[PDB]
Design a protein around this nucleic acid. Structure first.
Ligand code: IHP
Ligand code: IHP
Ligand code: ZN
Ligand code: ZN
Ligand code: ZN
Ligand code: ZN
Lengths: 384, 355
RNA sequence: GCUUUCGUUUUCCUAUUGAGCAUAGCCGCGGCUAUGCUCAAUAGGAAAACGAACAGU
């Protein structure tokens, strides 16, 4: 099953970039999101991302003209958001049966179908909490019929909240670092910190894959499976994405309001590993692709968060673009009240998601993990 | 021009540190031909917490670079005014003012400011997106111009628990109310700046709004209301031609450094977290409000002014009706333009009697 | 001891400008056109070795 998913992703990517320059043959982390219409359906790759770089501290934009992280699975979810936006433009009364959404209780917001299953394929494991192991301890693949998760908590430093920092390799925890995120502080030379990968999947599961922007229109979309081409671990990943939150009993889950409930998807490894993995050859290119694009494999610069080339125009997976798509959806959905408001105010306007996020940070702090280190408030709130 | 200012400031810093990062400095120029000499110098990017507050004003609060440099310059001005006498008025930079009651600085002498980076607050609100003489600010979003308060454990600010105002705001307060401090308006006319040199960041519209031109956004109705001899100063804004192109994202030193012309080689170190001298003995800071009050009392005793020897620090500060009116009008004008409310500390901190 | 940014050395290619040597051609002893090699300056792309960025697994 996982072998089919990996072959699907690799085939789509290779058939897309067959006629491009050879300079794309270097080391790259390839991450895709594949949809399955039903159990018997073969499945089609619905979102493709590459790139392993983040903007520099000076490169940050007060008008949202950068992609803060160009990472493989992060770009994969940005393309997934673009796919969801495109589908919501496609979604209507006539194509409801073919579409991938069905209205929830009251019809205010939609949810994915139960047959339609989402599977996040990644070449390697997500950075941060999901990478607490060693290469020589990479466990093999077994076929378990049960859906029961077995997370591991052997050390108190496992499960904390971590951040990836510019110029700084690895993932650094969210300690009680009293440096409040401030814009001009960063400009004068304070490091920029970004929420890590697995720490940004805990949210996708406790809160939603759609982010806080998209929860105004659809119910939280949950991963149905995570397939890893490399660095797969059962307990570590299962803790990192779904059950680090509920280590201390159901008191965390029961407090969380519907529909923002925890969810333990199925995890898996590709049937046959890929032999080639060299430490070097890492390139600044980032390939972004959505299913609605066609044959355009957009190329970006991760050191600067913009399109590769001397022109270096605006990309399409950036906060400005995603907010333009937000405005397009609002115009399509007649969301006039939210159509004339700002960015951070729009993120906070999701009362349910905001309260769920606050409960998330409160519980993460109570279990001795950490708060939710964020960007400066004037960077997460801008106008166009 | 501005490259000369930067080189002079940096060589003076090196000269002070030969016997032994952000920087602000104030230099004096007797004339165009003269090279110029430093009078104030400071560093630092820290502010005290909410637990080290002093009811008697024994601890310095705002430990940033520009503010401590201004302080130090105030101490130099106290020493320079004390050195005045009728025998050596010609060689001194002071001359009697109108009415003969108060001194003033000479017309040829000018004061310039160099800041190694854009000041915090409204001075670094721009992303990557000396021929002139007119000031042209930029007003793009309502966020620009809002008063900001320093945060604890950080270089940045937050828009408007102990709270201190941002560096750019304070350098607006100087330009409006002069550099002469609070207790020296009895005997001294206000002293202003002439130029500003931002050696590592620069915007021809952002700094002029940060320091000078934001009190002129809604017209010239703020200068006329202010009473003479208090006027808004517009220093000439410049950037060093060749700058350090490389940005350090690592940790920095929190200790502030200060020096003034009258000190000589007595470089002083402070810790911004607490507000005391760097040392296990927990020494009293020589630039604290206590020392300023003591020097003011010494100046009144020397000048045979027994009138102000009875009053306390707060009473002496409010005794000058013109200056307090100028302050109150400045704060009201900042409030009126929708830039926020100047967070004034309670009067109990500065209302103490020496024992 | 594995896990983004700075640089140093070497190699290769493309583009622009200038000089030296040799060959073929033409015009009124002189001058001009084309080709091969060497050097000097700048821009872009690729690879190898080494060094530092801070900080947590
Ligand atoms: O870019 P992403 O990795 O997809 O996540 C970004 C952003 O993180 P970045 O630092 O990378 O920009 C925010 O994460 P933090 O600021 O907390 O670190 C978060 O928004 P919040 O700050 O409100 O949590 C999230 O938003 P969402 O919840 O919708 O997924 C989303 O923001 P964008 O939609 O602007 O990309
Ligand atoms: O010593 P500084 O850092 O340069 O600032 C202090 C103080 O500011 P902070 O308490 O924030 O550090 C006062 O500002 P407020 O807090 O009261 O708003 C104000 O003196 P006032 O109490 O009279 O306002 C000011 O300037 P000034 O020279 O006019 O006094 C000066 O006070 P000191 O000169 O006593 O240090
Ligand atoms: Zn990552
Ligand atoms: Zn689980
Ligand atoms: Zn500052
Ligand atoms: Zn001005």
């Amino acid at each position: 099953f996982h072998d089919q998913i990996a072959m699907l992703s690799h085939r789509c990517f290779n058939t897309l970039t067959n006629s491009f320059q050879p300079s794309l043959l270097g080391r790259k982390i390839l991450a895709a999101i594949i949809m399955k219409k039903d159990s018997e359906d073969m499945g089609v790759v619905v979102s493709l991302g590459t790139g392993n770089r983040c903007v520099k501290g000076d490169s940050l934009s007060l008008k949202g003209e950068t992609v803060n992280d160009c990472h493989a699975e992060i770009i994969s979810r940005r393309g997934f958001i673009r796919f969801l936006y495109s589908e919501l433009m496609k979604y209507n009364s006539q194509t409801a049966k073919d579409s991938i959404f069905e209205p929830a209780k009251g019809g205010e917001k939609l949810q994915i179908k139960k047959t339609v299953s989402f599977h996040l394929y990644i070449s390697t494991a997500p950075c941060g909490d999901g990478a607490l192991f060693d290469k020589s301890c990479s466990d093999r693949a077994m076929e378990s019929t049960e859906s029961r998760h077995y997370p591991v908590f052997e050390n108190p430093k496992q499960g904390k909240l971590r951040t990836k920092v510019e110029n700084g390799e690895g993932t650094i925890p969210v300690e009680s670092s009293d440096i409040v995120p401030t814009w001009d502080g960063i400009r004068l030379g304070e490091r920029l910190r970004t929420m890590s990968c697995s720490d940004k999947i805990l949210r996708w599961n406790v809160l939603g894959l759609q982010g806080a922007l998209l929860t105004h229109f659809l119910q939280p979309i949950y991963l149905k499976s995570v397939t890893l081409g490399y660095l797969f671990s059962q307990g570590h990943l299962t803790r990192a994405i779904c059950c680090r939150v509920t280590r201390d009993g159901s008191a965390f889950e029961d407090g969380l309001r519907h529909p923002f409930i925890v969810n333990h998807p199925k995890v898996g490894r590709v049937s046959i590993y890929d032999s080639k993995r060299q430490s070097g050859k890492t390139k600044e290119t980032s390939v972004n692709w959505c299913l609605a694009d066609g044959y355009d494999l957009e190329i970006l610069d991760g050191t600067r968060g913009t399109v590769d080339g001397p022109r270096n125009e605006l990309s399409r997976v950036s906060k400005k673009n995603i907010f333009l798509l937000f405005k397009k959806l609002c115009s399509f959905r007649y969301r006039r009240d939210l159509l004339r408001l700002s960015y951070g105010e729009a993120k906070k306007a999701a009362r349910d998601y905001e309260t769920a996020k606050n409960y998330f940070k409160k519980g993460l702090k109570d279990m001795g993990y950490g708060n939710w280190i964020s960007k400066p408030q004037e960077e997460k709130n801008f106008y166009l």
